[PDB]
Design a protein around this ligand. Structure first.
Ligand SMILES: Nc1ncnc2c1ncn2[C@@H]1O[C@H](COP(=O)(O)OP(=O)(O)OP(=O)(O)O)[C@@H](O)[C@H]1O
Ligand SMILES: [Mn+2]
Length: 245
């Protein structure tokens, strides 16, 4: 399967000179993944695969130039490697390999749902098998920082403003998308000049048995994080603000 990978890496134009990229792509992705990326290029979604943005246990994220809705766009390409409590209980999905494809579709559908409700998430473009294409958040192929990445640079920003941005986005997600993120924290929120929520495969519908418990957890994470930056908030007030109580 190494021969297959190297071949697709050539066809995708992921070159030796493109830094450490070719070695990272060849280890983190597999032949069948790169086949799907090359079918996406052929179909006109991807013009050029770019740098490696993140490598994880569940997912890898890469930059690409691509085309969506007739125009050139910057893309985040998120790829799930080929979870349960967050799938089961979500009735939207009529229940190894196939499981990863559902999860991909799950995240895509959640992005679309959240976006339609007015939540600040990356514009979703398309998915295919284990690959999800979405709006690149950042500039000049540099990803926007997450809240953790921001660090004490937050002290120089309007932290309370950022907090209130976060809360408003959770409230829309809940009241208008009827979803709970379920892994909301400083690690999954990005900021350029407004916050964006990312990482939504696990998000569940308010029909899920655990939605309220996951929501309470999200709220506590956000109060915990912002307490370190001088923002005074109460759990009851934020929860009620979000749930419209
Ligand atoms: N749309 C995007 N635009 C720019 N950067 C992104 C985008 N999506 C993700 N990233 C970057 O890639 C990193 C990893 O993304 P993400 O949080 O979705 O997955 P993960 O935590 O590594 O694994 P998984 O999503 O499957 O749980 C993010 O912290 C962010 O820095
Ligand atoms: Mn994440």
């Amino acid at each position: 399967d190494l021969k297959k990978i190297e071949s697709y890496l050539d066809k995708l134009r992921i070159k030796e000179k493109d830094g450490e990229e070719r070695k990272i792509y060849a280890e983190v992705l597999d032949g069948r993944t790169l086949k799907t990326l090359y079918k996406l290029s052929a179909k006109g979604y991807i013009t050029a695969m770019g740098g490696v943005i993140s490598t994880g246990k569940e997912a890898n994220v890469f930059y690409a130039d691509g085309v969506f809705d007739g125009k050139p766009v910057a893309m985040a390409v998120k790829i799930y490697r080929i979870m349960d409590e967050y799938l089961y209980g979500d009735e939207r999905f009529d229940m190894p390999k196939e499981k990863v494809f559902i999860w991909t579709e799950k995240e895509f559908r959640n992005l679309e749902r959240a976006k339609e409700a007015g939540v600040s998430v990356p514009q979703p473009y398309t998915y295919m098998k284990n690959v999800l294409l979405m709006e690149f958040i950042g500039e000049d192929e540099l990803p926007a920082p997450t809240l953790v990445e921001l660090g004490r640079e937050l002290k120089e920003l309007d932290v309370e403003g950022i907090f209130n941005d976060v809360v408003e986005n959770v409230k829309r997600l809940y009241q208008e998308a009827e979803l709970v993120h379920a892994d909301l924290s400083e690690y999954n929120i990005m900021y350029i000049d407004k916050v964006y929520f990312i990482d939504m495969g696990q998000a569940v519908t308010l029909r899920h048995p655990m939605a309220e418990s996951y929501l309470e957890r999200d709220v506590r994470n956000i109060i915990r994080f912002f307490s370190k930056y001088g923002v005074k908030a109460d759990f009851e007030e934020m929860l009620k603000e979000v749930k419209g109580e």
